């Protein structure tokens, strides 16, 4: 057998005042187009909610590329109107995983501001703010169980300004509270660029 494709199933809606997240495709649809790999629905929007058969997590457009955890995409390719898209940026040292950016999706730019106060948006359209503490952590300003930073992975770390400051990529936790988070740095990706 051969495994699926990546599946856009939904975004996080950050175009208003308020942050939340759409579906787009349901479980059923979702499972046909990671076998055929053929995706014509309209995407939107910088975040995209991801899903493979067996995972469910976020993918983050930057600089026209659409970047992911590579503990959720692995090497599989994603669907697309016409089938599905070879990776086209693969680091299993950094967890990074990256395609060619959607037709209408929008790219967020990468940030250049030096900024330490950051902001986490998960899969729940939950804007997080976090304090960054390194160059691939930053401190949770009110901690929470790590429940509800699951399937988030992919998604950004944005500057004041709304740029992308890095991707989710794991939580550090004690007794199963999320106290801070590790990030692939967007400098990071303009390097594997
Ligand atoms: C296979 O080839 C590769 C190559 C390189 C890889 N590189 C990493 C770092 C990795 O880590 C795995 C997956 C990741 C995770 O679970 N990611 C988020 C997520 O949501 N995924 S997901 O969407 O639900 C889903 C699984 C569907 C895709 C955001 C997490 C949300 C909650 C945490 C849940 C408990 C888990 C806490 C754990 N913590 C941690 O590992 O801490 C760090 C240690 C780090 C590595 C050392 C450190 F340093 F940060 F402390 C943690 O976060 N993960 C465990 N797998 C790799 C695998
Ligand atoms: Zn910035």
């Given at each position: 057998?051969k495994k699926?494709?990546?599946?856009?199933?939904?975004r996080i809606?950050?175009?208003?005042?308020?942050?939340?997240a759409?579906?787009?495709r349901?479980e059923?649809?979702?499972?046909?187009?990671?076998?055929?790999?053929?995706?014509?629905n309209?995407v939107?929007?910088?975040?995209?909610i991801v899903?493979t058969?067996?995972?469910?997590?976020?993918?983050?457009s930057?600089?026209?590329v659409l970047?992911?955890?590579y503990?959720?995409?692995?090497?599989?390719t994603?669907?697309?109107?016409?089938?599905?898209?070879?990776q086209m940026?693969?680091?299993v040292?950094?967890?990074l995983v990256?395609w060619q950016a959607?037709?209408?999706?929008?790219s967020?730019?990468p940030?250049?501001c030096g900024?330490?106060?950051?902001?986490?948006?998960?899969?729940?359209?939950?804007?997080?703010?976090?304090?960054?503490?390194?160059?691939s952590?930053?401190?949770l300003?009110?901690?929470?169980?790590?429940?509800?930073?699951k399937?988030?992975?992919?998604?950004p770390?944005?500057?004041?300004?709304?740029?992308?400051?890095?991707?989710?990529?794991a939580?550090?936790?004690?007794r199963?509270?999320a106290?801070?988070?590790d990030?692939?740095?967007?400098?990071?990706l303009?390097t594997?660029?």
């Amino acid at each position: 057998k051969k495994k699926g494709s990546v599946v856009i199933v939904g975004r996080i809606n950050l175009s208003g005042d308020t942050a939340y997240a759409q579906q787009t495709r349901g479980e059923e649809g979702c499972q046909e187009t990671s076998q055929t790999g053929r995706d014509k629905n309209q995407v939107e929007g910088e975040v995209q909610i991801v899903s493979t058969a067996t995972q469910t997590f976020l993918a983050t457009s930057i600089n026209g590329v659409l970047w992911t955890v590579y503990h959720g995409a692995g090497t599989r390719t994603i669907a697309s109107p016409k089938g599905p898209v070879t990776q086209m940026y693969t680091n299993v040292d950094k967890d990074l995983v990256g395609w060619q950016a959607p037709q209408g999706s929008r790219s967020l730019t990468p940030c250049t501001c030096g900024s330490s106060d950051l902001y986490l948006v998960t899969r729940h359209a939950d804007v997080i703010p976090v304090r960054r503490r390194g160059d691939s952590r930053g401190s949770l300003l009110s901690p929470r169980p790590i429940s509800y930073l699951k399937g988030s992975s992919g998604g950004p770390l944005l500057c004041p300004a709304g740029h992308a400051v890095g991707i989710f990529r794991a939580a550090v936790s004690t007794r199963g509270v999320a106290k801070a988070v590790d990030f692939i740095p967007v400098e990071s990706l303009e390097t594997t660029m």
